[PDB]
Design a protein around this ligand. Sequence first.
Ligand SMILES: CCCCCCCCCCCCCCCCCC(=O)OC[C@H](COP(=O)([O-])OCC[N+](C)(C)C)OC(=O)CCCCCCCCCCCCCCCCC
Ligand SMILES: CCCCCCCCCCCCCCCCCC(=O)OC[C@H](COP(=O)(O)OCCN)OC(=O)CCCCCCCCCCCCCCCCC
Ligand SMILES: CCCCCCCCCCCCCCCCCC(=O)OC[C@H](COP(=O)(O)OCCN)OC(=O)CCCCCCCCCCCCCCCCC
Ligand SMILES: CCCCCCCCCCCCCCCCCC(=O)OC[C@H](COP(=O)(O)OCCN)OC(=O)CCCCCCCCCCCCCCCCC
Ligand SMILES: CCCCCCCCCCCCCCCCCC(=O)OC[C@H](COP(=O)(O)OCCN)OC(=O)CCCCCCCCCCCCCCCCC
Lengths: 347, 98, 311, 70, 96, 110, 175, 105, 80, 57
Amino acid sequence: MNPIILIIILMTVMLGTIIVMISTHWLLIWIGFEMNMLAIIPIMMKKHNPRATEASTKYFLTQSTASMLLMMAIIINLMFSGQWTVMKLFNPMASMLMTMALAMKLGMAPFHFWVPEVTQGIPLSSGLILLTWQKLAPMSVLYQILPSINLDLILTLSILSITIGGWGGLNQTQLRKIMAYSSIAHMGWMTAVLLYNPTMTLLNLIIYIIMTSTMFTLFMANSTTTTLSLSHTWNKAPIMTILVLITLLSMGGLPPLSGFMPKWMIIQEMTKNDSIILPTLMAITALLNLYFYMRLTYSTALTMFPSTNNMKMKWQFPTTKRMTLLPTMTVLSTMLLPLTPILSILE
Amino acid sequence: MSLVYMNIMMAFTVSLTGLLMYRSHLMSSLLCLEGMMLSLFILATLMILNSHFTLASMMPIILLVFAACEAALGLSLLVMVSNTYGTDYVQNLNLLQC
Amino acid sequence: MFMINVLTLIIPILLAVAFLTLVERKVLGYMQFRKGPNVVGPYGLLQPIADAIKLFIKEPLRPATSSISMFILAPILALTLALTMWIPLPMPYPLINMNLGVLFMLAMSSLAVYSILWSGWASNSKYALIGALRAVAQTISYEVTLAIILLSVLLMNGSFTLSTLIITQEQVWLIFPAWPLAMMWFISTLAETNRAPFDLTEGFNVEYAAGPFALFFMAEYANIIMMNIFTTTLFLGAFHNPYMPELYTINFTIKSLLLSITFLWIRASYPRFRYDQLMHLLWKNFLPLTLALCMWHVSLPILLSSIPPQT
Amino acid sequence: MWFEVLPGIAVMGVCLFIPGMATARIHRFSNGGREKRVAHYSYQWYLMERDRRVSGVNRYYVSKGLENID
Amino acid sequence: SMMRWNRERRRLQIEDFEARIALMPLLQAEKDRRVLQMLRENLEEEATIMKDVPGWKVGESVFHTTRWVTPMMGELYGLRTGEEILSSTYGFIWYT
Amino acid sequence: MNLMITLLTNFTLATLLVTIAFWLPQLNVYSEKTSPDPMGSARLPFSMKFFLVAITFLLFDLEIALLLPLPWASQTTNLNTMLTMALLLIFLLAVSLAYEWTQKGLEWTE
Amino acid sequence: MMTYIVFILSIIFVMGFVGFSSKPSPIYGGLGLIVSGGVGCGIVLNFGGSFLGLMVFLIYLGGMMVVFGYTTAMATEQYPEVWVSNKVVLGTFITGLLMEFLMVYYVLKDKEVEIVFKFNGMGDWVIYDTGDSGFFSEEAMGIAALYSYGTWLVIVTGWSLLIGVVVIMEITRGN
Amino acid sequence: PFFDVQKKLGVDLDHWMTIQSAEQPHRIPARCHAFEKEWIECAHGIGSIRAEKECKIEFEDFRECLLRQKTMKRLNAIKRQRDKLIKEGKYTPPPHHSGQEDLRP
Amino acid sequence: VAAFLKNVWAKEPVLVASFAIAGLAVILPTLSPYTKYSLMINRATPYNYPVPLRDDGNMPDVPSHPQDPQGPSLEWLKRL
Amino acid sequence: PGIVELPSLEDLKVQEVKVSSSVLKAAAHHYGAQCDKPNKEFMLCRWEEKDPRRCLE
Ligand SMILES: CCCCCCCCCCCCCCCCCC(=O)OC[C@H](COP(=O)([O-])OCC[N+](C)(C)C)OC(=O)CCCCCCCCCCCCCCCCC
Ligand SMILES: CCCCCCCCCCCCCCCCCC(=O)OC[C@H](COP(=O)(O)OCCN)OC(=O)CCCCCCCCCCCCCCCCC
Ligand SMILES: CCCCCCCCCCCCCCCCCC(=O)OC[C@H](COP(=O)(O)OCCN)OC(=O)CCCCCCCCCCCCCCCCC
Ligand SMILES: CCCCCCCCCCCCCCCCCC(=O)OC[C@H](COP(=O)(O)OCCN)OC(=O)CCCCCCCCCCCCCCCCC
Ligand SMILES: CCCCCCCCCCCCCCCCCC(=O)OC[C@H](COP(=O)(O)OCCN)OC(=O)CCCCCCCCCCCCCCCCC
């Protein structure tokens, strides 16, 4: 791809998300989602292989269905309110449609069935964009319409997302599908605390983006796409070996790491509102995420080691790859928990 | 609510059910998706002309243009699929199971 | 009384299309140093009637159609869109006086490629389908400059009303401030109807019989006469006295005949373009000039304070 | 010679002259010897329906002048 | 030539619009008496139709406010014949 | 109303001429003929160039759809903004054309 | 009968989507969507939305569905159908379309008038000609205001169309 | 994340299309200009929670101006009673609703 | 910048004509004196009703009859 | 709600101007010149009261 065209397309992705973030009008919300999808479609097809075309086709179908459902919710709002302010919705039918459409754009279960496929089909930097930058616009719309979001529907989608993102991580050797099911589980975590404290929604979002960006940056630094290919990291770059795995111990949700910062705070906002059963169940399912991801941790820092002889040649060449913000993002994804009351900046 | 709006919503849900039960082709998916876009155009237009809300009359054209550009993108995706397999069949799009 | 008016539009259209074949064969005769038909009737005046009765009892080819419905709906759509382009044409007062007759005609001519596409898919041939796809690509290519030239000219009109276009040109012809738009419009209407030198179909609907081919043929010639009349109204607009409308009717009739014979005189003068050469003519020659003149005819009534009235 | 094309051109010219002459005569026949009222806009239609109501015979083209006021 | 003639046509458009402006008080007064005539007729025929139905305030508004509401097409032409309804609601749209 | 009557009469005349064109030579008992072109049994290969010119038509047609209310927008009071946005739309149509040029998009149907 | 015409078109509009949401073929799917676009355009035009109906014809139907039929015709390899003499090749078409209009007239039955007559819209629904507007279509001036009032809207729309051109030319390259 | 850039910088990017009561071209009113203006002036600045329960009368007047469901219900009731009385033969229509009265202006 | 212009006028006169017409369409509405009259005519075209004002007592610039001296006059448009 | 107070039929009767629209358009500019004062007092009452029931007389 032409690098000027790459810069223009990435600024158009950022522009579409910014237009969703700054607009007081529903048509510009829809326009920003359309611009974001239209610009991110060549990011997936950076390598021009059939798996990227299949991934982009599935992504187009799901995001286009979500865009049309979003426009139907906007149209029903214009029926029952005659106006266009991005605020609470004035029909629970339009509220249910916009909640379903934003759950489709986030890939929350039971609309999760495109997230492990598309992330498998595309490269690691485009999967990084799909799992970090593309969450920002529908979570912003959910932040702006929460006086109309149905409680039972968002809790159903949240716990179903956490359970399915939990039980998706068993049978996988692909690093990208494991990041996709971790995405689904964390979106269930974010939308669990949305109608109780959306500051914890933004805290969970920022900690999730920092941990996901650290993990994809490590995957790009080592050029490893599977568990078995990740297993050779100890012999090539031994400093790369543990940083992946303390970041993934963070991504499970485990003290004293900063990935324990969102979930605890989420529980800290749901025991206030007299829900004791629901954060208990959701964080037991987070322990199930710890179960499978700790099995992957055992895979890399321990037993299944053995190397091949061509690795000896890689010892005579350093990484000339840009590991952009990787020490910064690795420090910010583990050691941030003693600065947990920084979250007041997200009000 | 009203009657002709209920008819346009009924068409939207019928093309949604056609968009949610795939038979053979990807072009059928794109056609049901653009029937959904058509029903959104019709229903937005009848609301905007009903209330005599003047500045929103540019809105369905906007709702056309972007989404028609969206359809162009979808057509190009179909073409690349049909350049790999020879057909636009959705069952050729199953390599991402693993 | 209105149905009488619809019949007195549509029957003389078909008679004029019937005798356009005679005018074409005679004028192409004398331009090719030969005579045209003069044996059948007196000076050939029964040649269209004989040709029509021949084509309408000729055997159907028993066509191996890929579909029944598109095979029937392509001549139906061709004739319906051939006739409905005439109803907003001001002669000096149209059959259907509508506020958006220009946009109506642009829409109904943009719908006219489905007859080509359905005739192409309704044939079993892959070669006929390739020729139909090439023809559809050509026609939708030249519809772009139809729309932009038409918009640029109607920036001097005030609105999309075709009867207002007579009021616009009461002092001067609109070919004087818009002759580059006129010449590119004229070549673009020449390239719409697959008329020479843009006739690569004779260089798609041969699956049909001779009768349905006569239907596509007469729809194509009704489009030729209609676009000549629309160009006459659009650039060479005649004088109109509201107490004697026959002055305007005879005047635009004479100008429309001269412009249709100008089509007949172009087709007996030039070789055909190659296909990529007329795609080069559109996308690399007519489209930059057409966009620049669109910018020019936007910004020119603003700088000359000659913005036309809305009503 | 070249004037042999003129009967066909004349027939085609009469065939193009008939629709415009026909619709002009029908507009003068159906509207009281005058042009058909053009209502492209709501004000023109409002004045037209006001004419249809003040004429008393459900016909807009019957003009009531100063004889209808005292 | 188009400069001089478009400027003259703009002056003619302003002349026609000033004719409209000079006529709008009479047309507005006749429109007011038109709609009040039709609403008084609908009120009286409503009062002579709705006798057997209990709990029916004749002329009861559906708006809780007392501000004048611009009457809908059915508040005026509801109890009339179908051809007048067609000429009222599709007359301008279907006009040639 | 008159428009719907005119469309219905044009459709009726079209269907009548098609019906006469099919049923009038099928009075004949001519011959039932047998034994069914530049390809005999070849499949259709796809061509990328025809699809490129179709999508180019669609995108410039959307840009024309934006350009269509200009004879009405000339009548507005904010003519400086209107002129800037009209020139900006036609300039973006020209930039789309120049990008279609320089990336060899207009080649072999130029 | 003539009063309920928009409603009648809406019923046909719904039936039009059942023409192609059942998906008999992408080509007949395009044909059903063209017929549905025409009748939904009739619904739009019968509220005084003349420019928006002509955008349905010029941009949705003649602009985009041409491209859908064009891309469909460059796929889905064809095969012949029944081609007997005129008692099959046009007679079955006419009987099938007469049964289609029989299906259109067949749904206006006792299960329909309980919804039509209890919720009578025609008489009080189509209210676009409620009073006078003046010397201008309000819908035309609202679309005209895209250039004076809609500066940001035109900027993001033209930028999305330029990015659409760039995105199509990048993904349709294969290199 | 609602980064209100339009209030920070002082630009009007999309506030003008938002409500019906904004500055329309050629001062065209909406059908419900007064009702939406009263709902906006009632519910202004007090927040959504107080705006739901403390401006319900103006909001229901505006919703009934939009949908006209109570007015269509009332007209269906009166027209149904009129049809039943014409069917029973206990009522006759007036001349000014049958079309023999030579309309006002 | 001049031999290049003669070269591009020799090779590609269509694009030279297009860029010249587009450049003039850009620059000439600002270099013109008659551009302000477009603005003045479009803001003096009365699409609405000129709603009168209640006379509070001290408004010298507002007339009482259309045939009064004060008020916005279109002598410039009639004369030009 | 309250009963909407519609005025009687006798409070609406007036001697109409029963002329056609071309009679009014031919006589438009002199009508705007000579019938200025009651027309503008009426339309001022009509835009201030926002109610034709108080704009009858
Ligand atoms: C409306 C009534 C009719 C109108 C007139 C039309 C009737 C005459 C018809 C004649 C017969 C036509 C036969 C078919 C024609 C097809 C071939 C053809 O001609 O193709 C078009 C040809 C194509 O040229 P070409 O094909 O030779 O070019 C070769 C191109 N390269 C080198 C890239 C391979 O010409 C054009 O495209 C020009 C179109 C008209 C341009 C008008 C410009 C006006 C002046 C602008 C300003 C210029 C100066 C700069 C600024 C100065 C400021 C002071
Ligand atoms: C209230 C909060 C509001 C929101 C706050 C801000 C949210 C920020 C979300 C950031 C999401 C970033 C997604 C990735 C960057 C986008 C562009 C991109 O992908 O650049 C990577 C670039 C691509 O290079 P390429 O050549 O394509 O590499 C592939 C192999 N050839 O180069 C590479 O691949 C090199 C490898 C390293 C790339 C590292 C990129 C990290 C970017 C994110 C940093 C962390 C997030 C920001 C700070 C915290 C805020 C949440
Ligand atoms: C395969 C099927 C068969 C194929 C052949 C037949 C169909 C295709 C060819 C015909 C196409 C039909 C087009 C019908 C609408 C045309 C647009 C139109 O109505 O424009 C005219 C006018 C707008 O102008 P304006 O002056 O503003 O209106 C009066 C305002 N005072 O607006 C008016 O005057 C409005 C008049 C009333 C509304 C007319 C509605 C017509 C019926 C609905 C559509 C019918 C066609 C459906 C199928 C289409 C398939 C392409
Ligand atoms: C708006 C303008 C439209 C104009 C359209 C018409 C253009 C053409 C104008 C007329 C041209 C001449 C027509 C006559 C041609 C010659 C016919 C003729 O006489 O043929 C002779 C033939 C043999 O008969 P026989 O008696 O054996 O001859 C031996 C001599 N004793 O005997 C026969 O052939 C038998 C007699 C047949 C006569 C047919 C005459 C032509 C019919 C035309 C019908 C349409 C006319 C226009 C209708 C609409 C306007 C009213
Ligand atoms: C600022 C005003 C607004 C400008 C934007 C609106 C413009 C309207 C027209 C839009 C045209 C869109 C397409 C333009 C593509 C330009 C690039 C190009 O065509 O380069 C190739 C060409 C060489 O020709 P070749 O490659 O051989 O052509 C194939 C057939 N033989 O290379 C060339 O032929 C060179 C073409 C570029 C240089 C032309 C210079 C013209 C100068 C005219 C006088 C000054 C005008 C003032 C503005 C400056 C413009 C540069």
